[PDB]
Write a protein that binds this DNA or RNA. Structure first.
Ligand SMILES: [Mg+2]
Ligand SMILES: [Mg+2]
Ligand SMILES: [Mg+2]
Ligand SMILES: [Mg+2]
Ligand SMILES: [Mg+2]
Lengths: 115, 188, 135, 31, 174, 76
RNA sequence: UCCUAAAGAGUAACGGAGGAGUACGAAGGUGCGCUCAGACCGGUCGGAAAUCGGUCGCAGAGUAUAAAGGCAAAAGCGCG
RNA sequence: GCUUGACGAUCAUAGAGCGUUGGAACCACCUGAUCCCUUCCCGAACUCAGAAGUGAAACGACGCAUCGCCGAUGGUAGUGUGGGGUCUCCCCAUGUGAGAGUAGGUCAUCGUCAAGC
């Protein structure tokens, strides 16, 4: 489109500097309906933990609010600590860290996971 | 149009120059559609008769490699620049059904009496020759006749003017160009 | 005479004159040509002595092409001058010929009017030039 | 922002507010 | 309110009219830019703050000033560096400013044709120049200066400019 | 008008070729503006000078888009 | 800085060509954003050219300062 | 393996152009801007609150070698060592062997999970 590749042009700076430092990356992906979150291992091609909204215990028609995204980042630290993962980075993927992005990344710090 | 060959199981630079002075031979290859490329020796005398012929370039020639026979069309002539004589030949097998581009001479058959010549200032300048072809080998265009007996002064001739008879296309019309062919202009 | 309009530099090395001529040895425009069989270099006044010889043995028509163009400037020091005070000035211009290169082309004439016309232009050039036909 | 200034007392008034100030409120075209 | 005139009359009409298959292929107006050219009196340093205050009232919105990008010595120097004053109008001030045109910005021109129907770009955009700042409500005649060269440039979601014509003939004044 | 005046030839080039063994802070390439890019474990100093940070064997591999030249050192 | 200089470094001539004897308290740091030149069509006093809108672009622009080697995590441009 | 998303692997035989085609899951446009927040002016972009509509545009797949891009074999140029000649240039023995062009290729190939079969 036009919007899609411009935020890909914004994302490749911090995503490429987290590659050189070899840090366990926490990615994110916002849509106009609902919000994803993944933890990708230190090779760019291996996913360890991944919590979403489209799972079969959370879809309720209310995804797309800031209150919906608080539970997404809440239920992802419980799968990374079950995978034994700390010392992570936070690629915001070209999204301005203000709204539903920032509220998800505060639920990660509460749930025992630390940056 | 017939020529007979041999096998040439000796490659390189040193073995390929001793052919030309000791035995008077010329190297060649035969590469085609469904088989492997096969190198070949020919004589400088026997290619000299074919290269002296007029329409031998746009024509099928049979080849006797050993007792092996093959209908062969020629598309290359590497040639010695300084003295002027033939170097290796690089011709082609002919499949009974394949598209087969090649090159065809022209003639400009009727230009003794032209409108631009007898009435106005008489000059006819042939720009192009050796116009290509793209045709099945069942019908060989040996040549194409172009007539400039009626074209007046100040007019030029494109590729769309002359025609390609009986299932012959032109690659230059398959691109977005139409090259000029012949002019009629005034002498100085 | 024939020389560039403007040049990115002013003076040039000497170099060498090696090899044969693989591109330049094929007749393209005319149907008769005078190709050169010995290496040398032509000094851009010989070209006008050879052009004005072909363009008066015809006098009727035809068309002339000049395939070669001098672009290499050469120097010459003045007299009673010792060596080593810089580099001399450009006096003339030179094209470099190597065996096989086609010099002149003609078309629209007879096969033997032209043959005795390149005899006039060959007696002004310092090279051994032959006669060739279009194939 | 807040740097801009409306005149919505007449902008959001009637387009056919007489032909005494607008000078033409029964027709717009003079042609 | 021409928007309420648009969705109710114009918007259902054109889908059958220009053989449009669905809803989302219909033309509509994207933005309006003005670009009052103060390229005259380059080294004036007095007319720009006047020209901002001119366009300040007839739009109800603050302008921006436009600088240069070269020193074209045949025209003028780069010393009088601001040259332009531009205003982009999005959808809320679009259909309200568009009503001043073709209703009350017709009679005070003293013209023959309100707009020619021959000047288009290839994509479907229309441009127009207005000579005076007199064609404006809520403006002075005595305190205004009659040096105001103003333009109107339209942008449409049209593929080619015949679709601009069927849109422009609805709210028309040619 | 007169023209001598050359300079003194800064000794550039590429050291430590394709199969060496390196120490912590050796100099790999004395660049003049990135003929070779910073690969896996190398440094890229002030005037674009590649230097090592860890130990191993130099690679000189061509990677990715733009076809750029990446000097990585491999713990092998 | 380039060429002579022979595909590692180095390498002469009263051999061919050019520059320096400085600027900058932001022209430095950082975070956040954003793309060039040119062509072309339309548009009021400008017109081959000023500002505006549009498509085509695919770095042919730019780099405080010579030329060479570079630049999309732009080493180019704006803001706190 | 097929469906859509995310992150990679490899950087054109993976590109461009033309044609064709997809929904109600996904995605995209969309509707509003009161409430976060934003624009050297502008809800365009950025952001938030959502599910009236649409698959148009965009985006994927599916076809076409028309442009592009890869590219043989043979010959040829040049060149290391040893000798030659008419010696500002070439030749012989021997090792090495392009570039350009030709026959033709190409509408990519994989990996990790999450929702579908
Ligand atoms: Mg060197
Ligand atoms: Mg050397
Ligand atoms: Mg800078
Ligand atoms: Mg950046
Ligand atoms: Mg090759």
């Amino acid at each position: 489109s036009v919007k899609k590749e411009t935020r890909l042009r914004r994302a490749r700076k911090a995503r490429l500097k987290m590659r050189e430092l070899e840090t366990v990356r926490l990615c994110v992906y916002r849509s106009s309906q609902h919000i994803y979150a993944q933890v990708i291992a230190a090779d760019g091609g291996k996913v360890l933990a991944s919590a979403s909204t489209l799972d079969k215990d959370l879809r309720e028609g209310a995804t797309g609010n800031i209150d919906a995204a608080k539970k997404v980042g809440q239920l992802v630290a419980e799968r990374a600590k079950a995978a034994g993962v700390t010392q992570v980075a936070f690629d915001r993927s070209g999204f301005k860290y203000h709204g539903r992005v920032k509220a998800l990344a505060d639920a990660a710090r509460e749930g025992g996971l630390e940056f | 149009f017939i020529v007979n060959a041999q096998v040439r199981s000796d490659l390189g630079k040193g073995a390929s120059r001793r052919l030309r002075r000791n035995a008077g031979l010329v190297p060649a290859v035969v590469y085609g559609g469904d088989k492997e490329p096969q190198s070949v020796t020919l004589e400088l005398r026997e290619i000299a008769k074919l290269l002296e012929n007029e329409a031998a370039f746009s024509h099928v020639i049979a080849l006797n490699v050993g007792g092996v026979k093959e209908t062969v069309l020629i598309k290359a002539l590497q040639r010695h620049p300084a003295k002027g004589f033939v170097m290796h030949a690089d011709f082609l097998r002919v499949v009974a059904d394949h598209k087969l581009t090649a090159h065809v001479p022209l003639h400009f058959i009727n230009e003794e009496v032209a409108v631009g010549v007898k009435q106005a200032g008489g000059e006819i300048s042939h720009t192009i020759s050796e116009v290509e072809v793209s045709c099945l080998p069942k019908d060989l265009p040996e040549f194409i006749e172009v007539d400039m007996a009626k074209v007046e002064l100040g007019q030029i001739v494109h590729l769309s003017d002359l025609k390609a008879p009986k299932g012959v296309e032109l690659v230059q019309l398959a691109h977005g160009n139409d090259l000029a062919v012949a002019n009629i202009h005034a002498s100085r | 005479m024939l020389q560039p309009k403007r040049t990115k530099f002013r003076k040039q090395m000497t170099g060498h004159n090696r090899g044969l001529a693989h591109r330049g040895s094929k007749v393209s425009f005319g149907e008769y040509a005078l190709k050169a069989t010995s290496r040398g270099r032509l000094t851009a006044r010989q070209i006008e002595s050879a052009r004005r010889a072909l363009t008066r043995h015809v006098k009727r028509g035809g068309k002339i092409w000049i395939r070669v163009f001098p672009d290499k400037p050469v120097t010459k020091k003045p007299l009673e001058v010792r060596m080593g005070k810089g580099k001399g000035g450009v006096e003339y211009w030179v094209a470099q010929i190597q065996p096989g290169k086609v010099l002149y082309e003609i078309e629209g004439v007879s096969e033997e009017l032209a043959r005795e016309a390149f005899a006039l232009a060959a007696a002004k050039l310092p090279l051994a030039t032959s006669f060739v036909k279009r194939t | 922002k807040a740097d801009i200034h409306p005149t919505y007392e007449a902008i959001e008034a009637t387009c056919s507010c007489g032909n005494v100030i607008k000078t033409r409120s029964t027709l717009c075209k003079p042609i | 309110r021409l928007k309420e005139l648009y969705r109710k009359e114009i918007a259902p009409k054109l889908k059958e009219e220009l053989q449009l298959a669905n809803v989302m292929e219909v033309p509509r107006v994207t933005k309006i830019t003005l670009n009052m050219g103060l390229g005259e009196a380059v080294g004036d340093k007095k007319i720009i703050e006047n020209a901002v205050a001119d366009l300040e009232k007839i739009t109800g919105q603050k302008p921006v000033v436009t600088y240069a990008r070269k020193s074209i010595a045949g025209f003028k120097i780069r010393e009088g560096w601001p040259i332009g004053v531009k205003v982009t109008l999005r959808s809320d001030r679009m259909y309200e400013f568009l009503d001043r045109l073709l209703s009350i910005s017709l009679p005070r021109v003293r013209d023959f044709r309100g707009l020619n129907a021959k000047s288009f770009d290839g994509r479907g955009n229309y441009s127009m120049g207005v000579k005076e700042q007199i064609i404006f409500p809520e403006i002075d005649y005595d305190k205004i200066d009659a040096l105001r060269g103003l333009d109107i440039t339209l942008t449409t979601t049209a593929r080619t400019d015949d679709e601009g014509r069927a849109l422009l003939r609805a709210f028309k004044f040619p | 008008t007169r023209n001598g005046r050359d300079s003194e030839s800064k000794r550039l080039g590429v050291k430590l070729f394709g199969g060496q063994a390196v120490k912590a802070g050796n100099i790999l390439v004395r660049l003049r503006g990135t003929k070779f890019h910073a690969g896996y474990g190398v440094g890229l100093g002030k005037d674009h000078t590649l230097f090592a940070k860890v130990d191993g064997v130099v690679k000189f591999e061509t990677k990715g888009a733009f076809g750029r030249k990446y000097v990585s050192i491999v713990a092998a």
